[model samples]
Target: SMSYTWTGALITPCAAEESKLPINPLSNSLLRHHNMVYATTSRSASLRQKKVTFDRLQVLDDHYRDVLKEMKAKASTVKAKLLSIEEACKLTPPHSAKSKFGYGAKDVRNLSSRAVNHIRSVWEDLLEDTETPIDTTIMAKSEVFCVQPRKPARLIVFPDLGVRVCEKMALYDVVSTLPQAVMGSSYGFQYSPKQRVEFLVNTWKSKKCPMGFSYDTRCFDSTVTESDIRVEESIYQCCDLAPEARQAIRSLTERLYIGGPLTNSKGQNCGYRRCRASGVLTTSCGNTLTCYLKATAACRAAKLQDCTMLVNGDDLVVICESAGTQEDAAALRAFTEAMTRYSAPPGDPPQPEYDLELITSCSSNVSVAHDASGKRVYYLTRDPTTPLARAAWETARHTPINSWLGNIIMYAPTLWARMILMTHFFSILLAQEQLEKALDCQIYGACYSIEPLDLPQIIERLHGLSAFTLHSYSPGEINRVASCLRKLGVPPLRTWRHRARSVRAKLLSQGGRAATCGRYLFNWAVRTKLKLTPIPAASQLDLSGWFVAGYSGGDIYHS
Candidate 1:
C-alpha cells in the first residue's frame, strides 16, 4: 500500500556568521562547528527530543591560539618572573653579613632556596592572575535544530539560542582537545577513549602480566588523579608531556594528565616512576611487558611469520584473510600493511602502500542533491540495504529516488568521512553499534563535508587523541529508549492514524494503533500458541528504526 513520496527533508545546523562564508571554510562547516564539547552535548540532546528547541548558536570565539599558546605564555611569564626573582635575590644577597659565614656558600645555598621559593610564589600568583582573564573570555555558541514541515503544524521554528558558557573556547589557546584534524589518523593512535583504552589494554594483555586494566586505573586513582600533585607534575614535567597535551587537559583536573607511581601486585611500585605517574601508559610499554611474559605472544609474531619452517621464504606464501574476491594481490598487500600498522606489531614490516577501494557494492539505492549554495539533501531509500549499506559500505553510495523529491540516498561522501570520525568517536569493535546509532540520526547526519579517503590526512588532523566515549546501546533494545521517552511525556503523533491508514489500507480496515496493537496481540498469540520468540521490547524497535518517521510524531518511516 505504501509508495515512495517525493517530499523529503534536509537537516542542517544553523550556519556560521554569514559574512565569513568562504573566508573561513571550517568556521561555517559543521565539522568545525560540531567538534566542540558543548556543541555535541546540545545537539545530541536536541535530536532525541521533538519539542525542545535551540537557536542563536553562539560560536566559541575563534581566536585560534589555544592551550599550547597559553602554556607557552604561562611558561614565558614564569621565565620572566624567574629572571626578576633572580635579580631580586641578587639585590637581596644571601651573604647576610659581610663578616661572611665561611665563604658564605651555605648562606648562598639558603639564599638559593629562598630565591626558588620566591620565584615559585610569584609564579603561582601569575598563574592565578591569568585564570580570571582566560575564564572571562567567551567562545562561540550556535543552536542545533530540527527544521521541516508538518501538516496543520506547518512549521514551528525554534529560536536562536542564548549566549551559553563556552569553557573550551575560553580555554582554547589553553587547550587542544582532539582537533578534527586527527579524526582519521592511521598511525595506530586512537581518539575515542575506548580505542586508546583498548589499545592500552591490549598492550597489557598477558598471562605473565597479572595486571588488570583496573591496576592501571588504580595507579591513576592512587597518584596522578590527585589535583595538586598533577599540577605540580604538569609544570615540572611540561617537557615530557606531549605537545598540545596541556591544552587538551586544562579543563580536566590535574589527575587527568598526571598519575601514579605504578605499584606491583604486592602494592610495591613496578615500572618506571614517570611512566607510572602519567596515568596513560603507552601501548608499546604495556604490550612489551606482556611480551616478556609469553615470549611467543607479540615478540614472536614476526618469528611466526617466518616460522612456516618451509625453509624457503618463497614457499611461505601469504594468503589474504578477506582475499580472492574483490581485493587483488595488490589490495592484499595494502590491507596487510594497514593491518600491521593497526596492530603495531613487534617487527617493523615495511609500511605497505595502501590503496583500498570503496566496499559498498550494494549501496546502489540511496540518493543526493545540492542547492545553489552547494548544500546537499540526502533522501534515504526504503530499500532494505540501507542498513547494510550504512554499516558495511566502506565508500559513499550515490542513488536517485525520484524527481522533485531530490535524491533518495545516504550521503556516502559524508558517511565515509563520518565513518572515520565515528571511528575516532568510538575506538573498538563494540563501538560499531553505537556509531551506527549516531550515524542513523537525522540531526547528527549533516555535520560534515565529504573528502576522499585520506586515512593519513584524517589521522593527521586527529593528532593522536583518544577521547571519544563511543557510547553503547543498553542491553535491552527500543524499550529501554522508549520507556524513558514515554515517562518524559513525549507525545505520539496526532496525524499518525491518517498517515498509517493511508500507507496501509489493511491497517485502516482494522483501525489504527488499535490495529497495530492487534498485530502485537496476535504476535503474542502466535508466540504462545506456536512456540516462537516473543516480540522485542519497544525501545529496540525505536532504536532500530531511528529517525524512520518524520519529526512530527513518534512514527517509524523508512526514509
Candidate 2:
C-alpha cells in the first residue's frame, strides 16, 4: 500500500511565508549568519512530499502477532469515555483554525449556537457517512533550523474544526489512556524530564553491563501503513465504549483515521493520505502503540535481553543487558532488519552505546552536571542549535510552537538554555514590558499558556531550586554549547553576562514578580549572588497536565 497518493494538485499556503531569519536587533544578537537559518514553507513541502510518499510493505511474523495479541489483551482491560461536545470544545485551543462552516474555535469553546449546530451536523455525518474520507489540510510546517543539509519540513494533515472537535469527543479518552495501559512503564510521555532522567539512570544502573541505543524512525508518521492504522482502531474498539462512541470510532476509523483526502490552506485538492494523519489526536498514541509493538517483536527476533524501552511516540531508547561487543552489534543489526521488515526502519542506524548518556532519544540526552551543593545531578539537555534558532524566531514574532518558553522550562538547568535561551528571551519580554503576557509553550508535547514572570516558580517546581543554582557542567555538555555558539555565530557568554547584568538591574528595580525573575534567573551574572529560596508559588502551582504525556503533532491543546 502507498503511504500517500497525490492528485497532482499543490499544497498551497494561505499567506506569504518567510523562509529566512529576519535581521532584527534581538535575532541578530543571538545569531549572526541570518541566512544560515531558514524556515520551510509550502514551497518546501513539495520536497517533503517526495521524501514521505512511498510504497509501504510490511512483513509480520509469528513474533509480531504474539506482541499484537499481548498488546490487545492489555488494551481490552481499559474503558474509554465519550466526551460531551461541550467537553471537547473546551479542550480546543483558543487560536485554533476556524471552520469553513461559519464557526471558530472561540465559538466552539463558548458553545455558540452556530458552532453547536455545525458540530452537531459534523457528528451526524460521522455516523452516517460510512466510507467518505475526511478532509484534512496539508501544510508545510514552518520550523527553525541551521543549515542542516536541507531537511524538508514535516507535513501536517488535520481535518477542520468540526471533525477535529468530533475526533476529541470520540477518541480523546482512548488516546489519553490506551498508550499507558498497553505499554506501562515503557510509555515515555508519562515522565517529566527529571523523572525521565531518573528512569533512564535507574534502568542503566540496574543492568550488570548495560548497553543502550536510541532508534530513529525515518518519518515515522508517513511510514505508518494502512494495516497499522487499522490495528490501532482495533485497539480503540476494544475499549468499553458507548454505542454512539463506538459508532463514532468506527466511522472515524474507516474514514478519517485510516486515510483522508488532503486539502491545502487555500481550499484546493492537494492529495490523499493512506497512512497516519500527523495532526490528528491519535497520532502520538497510535505511533507509540505501533512502534512499541514492532520493537518488542524485533527485540525478540534479535534475542535482546531484558530490554527496557522508553518510547515517546516513535522516539525509542532501549536500555538492556549487553550481550558482548560483537554480539550486541550483531543483535542491533538483527533488530534493525526485523524493524525494517516491519516498516519502521531507522533514519540513522542504531548503534550500541555503553554509556547511557551517549544514547540520545527525543532529541535530548541525559547529562551530568553539578548543582550548587557540588553534587552531581543527572539532567536532560540537547544540542542548542535548533532551540537557539527557534528562540531567535520567537523574539522576532509569535509562533504556535513556542520553543523559547518550552526550552526554558524543560532544559532550565542546561548551560545554554539558562544562559542563552532564558536570558535572551527574558530580556526581550521585559524590554517590551510583556513579561506578564500569557504565552503558549509545549513541554512533553502538551501545550499551556505561560507567563514569563512565573518562570521562577515553574523552574523551582520542575527542576527544583537547583536549576536556578546549577553551575558546573559536564565538559561534554559545555563543549556542545560552545560548539553550537560558534556554528550559529552567537555572541559568547561574556557578552551575554554583561548584557544580562544590565537587564537584571532594570528587572530588579521593577520589584514584585519581575524582581524575583531578575534575582533568581540572573544570579549567575552577579558577583554576589542573591540567596535563591523556594518560590512561594512553586508549592502552590497547579501543574495539571504538565508531565502527563507527549502530544507531539497530536494537535492536543490544554487550558
**Highest-scoring model, lDDT:** 2
Q: TM-score of every model? A: 0.19, 0.97
lDDT of 2 by residue, 269-369 (tens): 87788888888888888899999999999999999999999899888989899989999999999999999999998899899999877778999999988
* lDDT score at residue 370, model 2, on the 0-100 scale: 79
Per-residue lDDT of candidate 1, residues 1-559 (tens digit): 0001111122223333211112122111112221111112222322422221111111111121132233334433321111233332332212221211122323323455543454344334333432321111101223221212211111111100000011111222211211111111211222222232233233323222211100011111111112223333343233323323333234222222222122221223222121111112111212221112112122122222211000000011121122233333344334333323222222222221111111111122122333223443322222221232222211112111111011111221222222222222222212232212212222111111121122212222221111111112222322432342233222222222232223333322445332332232122112222222233322132222221111111011122
Q: What local distance difference test score does each model get?
A: 0.22, 0.87
TM-score of 2: 0.97
RMSD of 2: 1.4
> Model 1: how large is the Cα RMSD against the reference?
26.7
